[model samples]
Target: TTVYLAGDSTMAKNGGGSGTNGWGEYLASYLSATVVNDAVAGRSARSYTREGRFENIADVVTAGDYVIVEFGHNDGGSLSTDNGRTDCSGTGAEVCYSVYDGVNETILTFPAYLENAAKLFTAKGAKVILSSQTPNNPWETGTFVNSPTRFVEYAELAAEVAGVEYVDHWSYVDSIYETLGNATVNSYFPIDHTHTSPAGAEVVAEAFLKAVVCTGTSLKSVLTTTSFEGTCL
Candidate 1:
């Protein structure tokens, strides 16, 4: 069995950011299954799919395999003048386009891309876990802003449409950050608010572990550490 990761730089391999770690690499230590971290730098849901990164996992995934889908860091903004990464402006059944170099590309909504990917994996008999994007920096403005963006709810709706699992990673990490507070949380982000350091990455990874373990998901059976607690949920 394997766990495939679908996300962006925040969850990429090899400290995806400067002096920071993307929880994707850190996740393997907590689970027994092999982790294929395919998350790349600077990718949104639309771009990750447009570039066939999702297919890379979809092709290899089989029955009992797991895919942790977390995007949204790069999914927002207008696609009229595209960066090849922006999604459309709505959550469902909406479309937008970007014309670049005399070529036009249709962009799907955030949840649509997620739902489409989850449907692919489910059809292949693999399990899909649609995780909400992790928090950037709640304290970036010197005020604790723990509420999640619309992307989190978009992920939830995507999971509903796909009939798969959903992990509120936004709320999970928010609980942890609220407990760690201003000073400690600052050190975890060495470069910027978006990326977390080695220490911070573990906290995020462990927070994920706690979610499945506590909720008694089938994934808990494949994990190496199933008994841990820190979340204030």
Candidate 2:
């Protein structure tokens, strides 16, 4: 079995020399299945789709495989230019229409794109897990962050709409940071508040495992470590 991760820089496989790592890189430690980190740096769902990255996954993903989809980092960018990576507003009322590579594109809200991604994976007979974006270092009071959390709201809504498993990484990790206090959690995010160091990635990975286990997904049966069991319980 293979567990495929689809996301942006925060979950991309950064080389060891970069001094930064994505949570997906460390997620393999807990799961018995093969971990395929297909997450690309700075690729949102729209960009990934436009660049044929999704086709790449669709070609290789077999029945019984698992796919975890996460976005919103780059999805919050401007929708006008290709450099900005086209993305929709949180509300579906607004749409972005553009042409790229001689092909016309109609972009929906972030949540709608998320639902489409889930549908694509499921069409391939793969189990889909939708994860809310991880929290950055911009911890404000309680679960609020310095930035807008529309990603969390939309992700949850996408999971509900798609009828798939959802992992609330944003809230889950935020609670940990809140408990650990600002100063301690801040140490985990040395490279800006958006990205994390290796240590921080591991922490996020553990939190992911806890979320998976708590959800009682099939992946939960393959977890080899008890480190995150406390969190699940």
Candidate 3:
């Protein structure tokens, strides 16, 4: 079985001399399936889909394969500028906009895009897993840093609507931060809170594995070992 990952820089392969790494790059160590890291560095769901990234996967993916979809970090960009990734109010909103191949296209909200992607994968008989965005290092007295686009909330809703497994990486890592304390957790993100160092990538990857087990998804069966300490359950 092949597990295809689709997301942003946080889950994309970092090149040589880069201090950071995407968690998906390390996910293969814990699973027996083939890992395909198709994620890009700065693409959001809208941009990725518009660029035919999903179409590329659809052309190659077959039945029984797993497609893990994640987006949101870049989705919260300014709507007024070309660089801003999203133009909608939220997942529940009726409209969003994105430019693809030099053409502006109207799109659904982030959650709706996620659900649509899930449907596309499911149509090919592929199991779809939606992952919430990983946490940044921002902190308040009792609240985790919120994404400008409400990525976590919409991600959960999308999974529920799609009837697929969802990995709450955001909350899971946030809990780890709380348990490890600010200083220790901060060390994981040496460059910035949004991206993680190699060490932090491993922790996020492990958290994803634990979430897979906790959800009792089909991917759990391919795990070589279930020894990770963190459990979302």
Candidate 4:
């Protein structure tokens, strides 16, 4: 049984900054050698799941295997919209606010893709967990923008509709941004709104570990409890 990761460059653990790299790289260290990183660069949820990658991974998945899926960064790109790309508006905190001329609007199709993917994994007796996209600088307060909330909603809804596990990385990153204050945005984002710095990645890794293990699993005995807690409700 392997833990397979499938998503975009943000989930890929390769290339240097201004190149390729993602938070999924750290996820393997948390688990044993059974984990397999299948994430590719610039892969949208639609592309990844549609091009048979999801099913190809699902084909080899055994009963005890787990598939952790993360996406939405590329899907929310602002430049394009015809090829299944979505704008970042209408997500998270911006749902009520109108900005970017709807370039940030979220496409509701992602949840369905996730739901179907989860169903495939579940049918094979594998546990499927959907991770909300990590926080980006656009959603930060007084920054270029605030975080997109649509991914969070879709991730949650996907997990619910698919009857799988959900990890809310978006909200965790938002809280981290607030905690670090405006001064740390550079350390977190550095040059891009879509990617995270090493420190930012570490923060993301920590939040993911907490979300999937501390809250989702009964492994509380291994984790040192803190005033910090996450929300799924």
**Candidate achieving higher TM-score, 1 or 2:** 1
Please give each candidate's TM-score: 0.95, 0.87, 0.89, 0.75
lDDT of 1 by residue, 1-233 (tens): 99999888778875565688788988887878999999988898988988898988999999999999999888887665677888888878898777854668887899899999999999999989999888987877766886778899999999998899988788888888877888888888887779889888888888888877666666777888665657435
CA lDDT, candidate 1, residue 85: 81
Cα lDDT over the full model 2: 0.76
Candidate of highest lDDT = 1
Q: lDDT at 169 for candidate 4?
A: 69
The C-alpha stretches of model 2 lying farther than 4 A from their native spots are 15-18, 80-82, 90-94, 99-104, 139-148, 229-233
Order of the predicted models by TM-score, top scorer first:
1, 3, 2, 4
| Tens-digit per-residue lDDT, 93-206, candidate 2 | 467777766767777777777777778888988888888898768553333353547887788888899888888887667666666766677777665767888887887888
Worst 10 residues of 3 by lDDT: 140-149
Off by over 4 Å in 4: 15-20, 77-81, 84-108, 138-146, 218-233
lDDT of 3 by residue, 153-231 (tens): 7898999998988878777677666666666667777766578888878888888887777778788878898888654
Query: For model 2, what is the alpha-carbon lDDT of residue 144?
Result: 35
Best candidate, TM-score: 1
Q: What lDDT is obtained when candidate 4 is compared to the true structure?
A: 0.66
Better of 3 and 4 by lDDT: 3
Clashing pairs in 1: none
Tell me how many clashing residue pairs each candidate has. 0, 0, 0, 15
